[PDB]
From a paper:
Further CpKRS:ligand structures were obtained for several compounds within the chromone series, including CpKRS:5, showing 5 to bind in an identical manner to CpKRS as to PfKRS1. There is a high level of sequence identity within the active-site region of PfKRS1 and CpKRS (96% identity) and an overall sequence identity of 47.7% and similarity of 64.6% across the entire protein. The CpKRS system exhibited behavior similar to PfKRS1: an accessible binding site and a high degree of flexibility of the loop and R295 in the apo-state and dramatic stabilization upon ligand binding, which, again, was supported by the large observed shift in Tm from the apo state to the l-lysine plus inhibitor state. This provided a rationale for the compound 5 affinity toward CpKRS. Our lead 5 is similarly active against a small panel of isolates: C. hominis (TU502) (EC50 = 6.0 µM) and the C. parvum Iowa strain (EC50 = 1.3 µM). Compound 5 showed in vivo efficacy in two different Cryptosporidium mouse models, the NOD SCID gamma and INF-γ–knockout mouse models.
Aminoacyl-tRNA synthetases catalyze aminoacylation of tRNAs with their cognate amino acids in two stages. Malaria parasite genomes encode two different lysyl-tRNA synthetases (KRSs) that play a role in translation in either the cytoplasm (PfKRS1) or in the apicoplast (PfKRS2), while Cryptosporidium parasites and humans encode one copy. We present a selective inhibitor of both Plasmodium and Cryptosporidium lysyl-tRNA synthetase capable of clearing parasites from mouse models of malaria and cryptosporidiosis infection.
Author numbering:
A (entry chain A): 45 to 545
B (entry chain B): 45 to 189, 195 to 545
Write the structure that this text describes.
């Protein structure tokens, strides 16, 4: 790339020649979309010589047809406009025609002034009098993502993706639309949006390993939040009744097609709801959003590339329920031992994992073993949206005991195409039990479970002030957008995803 | 505490007796606000014995008037409702009347079922048949209620309507702000809070580590360098509202995480951004207050009240000229010369201004502005045209040598906004980044390392662009009339 070097030299040339060098302000008359709305339907060959307008965008094409005529395409805000620059119309106060145009390259951000209309062949055009180089491009660009060095370039240099690929631009617009729809749903129910800390003295609220940091003046270690749950529940103690939060969680684990170290989640807590109420809301909210985007409840998905097969995901309600333990037992052809957290059941579940070639967790806690078994036997049955329900207490330290089922909790997870989208429960509000499950979590952490959380006394003290019967819920926004926008890699739906070295 | 131990014992006794112990679901008939709207203007003494309703809230008052009659107030969703519990209405299949009510204490979350109406004295009431303890309070509550309010925010919310108001106002303000930019065609985005290289402001970062990637990371101090990459990418009008993390001081206007809004607008300059700032903020003030002139208590609610006037046009102060007016003498040129650095140290010594460390031209300029210029900004006031040497991402001023197209907005001497015509020329940008890396190497912990990924993005052509940041928490402080940032953040950082 002599190209980059030579462009730096061209620019120092222009600068030293007293020619326009990175002008501070270019005043457009209207956006390119506005220009196409206003003039896109004029007759072929129409020109309005009584109207002078200024436009700007990035140059996608330059073709000099003759010594007297240059055609540009400029692109901005999803619209292309042709610029026809005829030597006879050039404003010599800006420089000589050939000098002015010799400064421009494909990729440059440029301004033009001229008369509006359409060429004889029917192309929406600006018949220019002047051209201004606003911000040059110092690299030779490809014309499509196909011409990049790797397809990793799309994620390491997202601005290239965005310049070249309409599909990538549509994803981020759909993401905003979906989030707006969600905020509207809850705002109409009378919820209050809140923000709770992302720096925590004690991390909690999920099965996740945290990022650790330190505040120098406070002389204290802090964790990045894994989830907002413990703070949100304190707002229900506080009487706020209906709260939600949409923001980042930080989880220090692996990166793959469905995991980024920071990701966006929504949580809500609703006083007087139970998990049955929450299943119903989940179904209403998500089917409404699918409808809003797709116009029916049966939507396409390409689980391999858009070069692979298309399947259909059916969101018609109500959705299938699978009971966690029973579905495991059906996959095994035999019962788990009771109690589920006894050493007898631990041993059995290790034996089952070996028998079914399921990779063992570390450490081999009852909860982690159950999770591996569910992963293999239950989550794999979840093609259409399906609730896995009634998780064991031993894996659910903040979920309230099941009103009917010994050793289980009033919990669900939503899975779509084998991927977890939501997690929700009737909230545990009984402090003695809450403390005991926190102690069991602390014991698991001490034994090497990097996903187990420490005891949070601040939270136990809050429960002692009385948490009303409450239902809470979380949704992974990024994974939702993967299904709505038909993407199979979370890197498609996050602007600047985490990338290896 | 005996009260807490005893309450645990009571709850075990209840459990062992087979009486209601943390019921899973209580189905209300309607909310307390709906109940008050439906029945609140009935005739005194009215009762409808044909309608049975279930209501719930937190008990704020218990008055056992007689052996036969107990009065409660419950509170839920900002509405109080009286419950009148008469032994002659009690459903004995829930327990004997004295047993059922003996389980209840001030602070408990409870449900009642009964008949709707109004007492003779004209109190909106439920005439109850039953009571269900849903979630007991194990602590004796104060009747009304700073350290506890921030460490146990649920107590503040439970007892103090003024705290609930602040958080509702916060949400309303941020909705207003979203609406403003959405109507202009902006796209809301999210950029990384975990950064290989921190940048986009002058701040000490938080440091962390990603174990699988085996890499140290920084928490973002600002989203700016990623957001500008989106303008290179063609997204034209982007905003982000989210947390920044700065490993610095904690005081009345600083919390280690805070909410900032940034936006980037292709084709704008800083003049456009001042006009937008005026329009946005004066319009929000008017929406909330009904006037452009609003109260503020700078020393808290025990002190004096002043008036902040948001009427436009807002005052502009030029950075260097206002320092020079304060000094009664000119700074030396160039502003980043050792001569000027040494002169600014003399001026700090003379005017009793605490010296920065290290004694860089930028830090000394900042100290002088803080003393002479920020202190003149009562009403919203733009400090404009900051020197380049303190503004490494701001584009050179089109007229004024050594300066940039930058502003800060100050209100009551506190920074609310920072904005500029963006530097889009990569040779100068690299030079200024080198100067920052040199500053860091000499001891400036607020200087950022060079980010080659950003320099490469600038080489692809950043359109002329204007960018801007607003401190949301400090805005709420003004709009809500609080002089401590801990009042506008639900769970502010507290000393250990
Ligand atoms: O969306 C995700 N999961 C679904 C939830 O568990 C998310 C939280 C909840 F919203 F509260 C309930 C549903 C998800 C996305 C990630 O990129 C990710 C990265 C990790 F390092 C660890 C877990 C991750 O999980
Ligand atoms: O609102 C604040 N400052 C105003 C701004 O600089 C904020 C960023 C901007 F919005 F982009 C432009 C305006 C503010 C609030 C804090 O709690 C805080 C804490 C610290 F540790 C360090 C700086 C802090 O700054
Ligand atoms: N904190 C949960 C989501 C809410 C669960 C119900 N309280 C998670 O991160 O999975
Ligand atoms: N990143 C700046 C605000 C935006 C300035 C204009 N690009 C700050 O943290 O102060």
């Amino acid at each position: 790339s002599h190209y980059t070097d030579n462009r730096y030299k061209m620019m120092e040339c222009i600068k030293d020649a007293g020619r326009p060098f990175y002008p501070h302000k270019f005043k457009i008359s209207m956006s390119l979309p506005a220009y196409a709305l206003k003039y896109g339907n004029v007759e072929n060959g129409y020109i309005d010589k009584d109207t002078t307008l200024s436009l700007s965008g990035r140059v996608t094409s330059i073709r000099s047809s003759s010594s007297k005529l240059i055609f540009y395409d400029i692109f901005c805000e999803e619209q292309k406009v042709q610029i026809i620059a005829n030597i006879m119309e050039h404003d010599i106060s800006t420089g000589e025609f050939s000098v002015s145009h010799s400064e421009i390259r494909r990729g440059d951000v440029v301004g033009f002034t001229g008369f509006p209309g359409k060429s004889k062949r029917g192309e929406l055009s600006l018949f220019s009098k002047s051209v201004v180089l606003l911000s040059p491009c110092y690299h030779m660009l490809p014309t499509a993502i196909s011409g990049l060095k790797d397809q990793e370039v799309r994620y390491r240099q997202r601005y290239l993706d965005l310049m070249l690929n309409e599909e990538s631009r549509k994803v981020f617009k759909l993401r905003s639309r979906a989030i707006k729809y969600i905020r509207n749903y809850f705002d109409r129910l009378g919820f209050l949006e809140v923000e709770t800390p992302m720096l925590n003295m004690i991390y909690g609220g999920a099965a996740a390993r945290p990022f650790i940091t330190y505040h120098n003046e406070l002389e204290t270690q802090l964790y990045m939040r894994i989830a907002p749950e413990l703070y949100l529940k304190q707002l229900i103690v506080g009487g706020l009744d209906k709260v939600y939060e949409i923001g980042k969680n930080f989880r220090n684990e692996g990166i793959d097609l469905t995991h980024n170290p920071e990701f966006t989640a929504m949580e809500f807590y609703m006083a007087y709801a139970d998990y049955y109420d929450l299943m119903d809301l989940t179904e209403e909210l998500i089917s409404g959003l699918v409808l809003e985007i797709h116009g029916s409840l049966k939507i396409p998905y390409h689980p391999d590339g858009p070069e692979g097969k298309c399947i259909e995901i059916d969101f018609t309600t109500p959705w299938k329920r699978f009971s966690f333990v029973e579905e495991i037992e059906s996959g095994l052809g035999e019962k788990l031992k009771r109690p589920l957290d006894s050493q007898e059941n631990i041993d059995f579940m290790v034996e089952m994992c070996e028998k079914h070639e399921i990779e063992l967790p570390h450490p081999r806690t009852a909860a982690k073993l159950l999770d591996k078994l569910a992963g293999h036997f239950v989550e794999t049955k979840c093609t259409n949206p399906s609730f896995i329900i009634d998780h064991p207490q031993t894996m659910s330290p903040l979920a309230k005991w099941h009103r009917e089922k010994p050793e289980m909790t009033e919990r669900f997870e939503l899975f779509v195409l084998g991927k977890e989208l939501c997690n929700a429960y009737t909230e545990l509000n009984e402090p003695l039990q809450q403390r005991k499950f926190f102690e069991q979590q602390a014991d698991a952490k001490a034994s090497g479970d990097v996903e187990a959380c420490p005891i949070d006394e601040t939270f136990c003290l809050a429960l002692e002030h009385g948490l009303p019967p409450t239902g809470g819920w979380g949704l992974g926004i990024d994974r939702l957008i993967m299904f709505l926008a038909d993407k199979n890699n979370i890197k498609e739906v996050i602007l600047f995803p985490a990338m290896r070295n």
